[PDB]
Amino acid sequence: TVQVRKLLSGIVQQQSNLLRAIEAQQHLLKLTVWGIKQLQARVWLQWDKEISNYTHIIYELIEESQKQQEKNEQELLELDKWAN
């Protein structure tokens, strides 16, 4: 019960982490579509900054998600240890 409450909290947090990653990746997708439509008109500097901006947010979230994923996996092994 004590170890479960800590595990549940970790999983909920990890779910928010993945959501933010998906939210941020969607903005990258919109920016890639924007670039394709820009080239389609033929046969921009702020675009490079915006691409860089979101990438920073995504990889910071991935890093945090990797750390959180390992915390959850260790606690689950601990919960299984105390159960048996």
Partner 1 sequence: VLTQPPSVSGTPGQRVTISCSGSSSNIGNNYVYWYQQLPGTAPKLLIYKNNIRPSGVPDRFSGSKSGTSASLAISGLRSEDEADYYCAAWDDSLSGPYVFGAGTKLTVLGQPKAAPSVTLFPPSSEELQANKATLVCLISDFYPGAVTVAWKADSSPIKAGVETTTPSKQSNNKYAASSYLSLTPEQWKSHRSYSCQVTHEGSTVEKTVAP
Partner 2 sequence: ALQLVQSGAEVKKAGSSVRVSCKASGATFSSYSISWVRQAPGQGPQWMGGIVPSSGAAKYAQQFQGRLTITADTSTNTAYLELSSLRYDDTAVYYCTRDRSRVRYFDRESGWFDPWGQGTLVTVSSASTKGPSVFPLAPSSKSTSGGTAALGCLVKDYFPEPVTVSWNSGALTSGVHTFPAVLQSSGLYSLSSVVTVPSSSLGTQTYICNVNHKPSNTKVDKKVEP
Question: What are the Cα distances from residue 69, in Å, to 5, 6, 16, 44?
Answer: 16, 13, 12, 37
Q: Which two tokens stand for residue 52?
A: 């860089």
Number of Cβ atoms within 10 Å of the Cβ of 17: 19
Stretch in the footprint of partner 1 (CB under 8 A) among 21-29, 32-40, 49-57, 76-84 = 49-57
Stretch in the footprint of partner 2 (CB under 8 A) among 16-24, 34-42, 49-57, 72-80 = 72-80
DSSP H or E run through 82: helix 45-83
The minimum distance between CB 63 and partner 2, in angstroms, equals 7
Q: Which two tokens stand for residue 32?
A: 């890639």
**Which residue in 66, 78, 80, 84 binds partner 2 (CB under 8 A)?**
66
Stretch in the footprint of partner 1 (CB under 8 A) among 10-18, 31-39, 60-68, 72-80 = 60-68
Q: Which residues bind partner 2 (CB under 8 A)?
A: 63, 66-68, 70-71, 73-74, 77
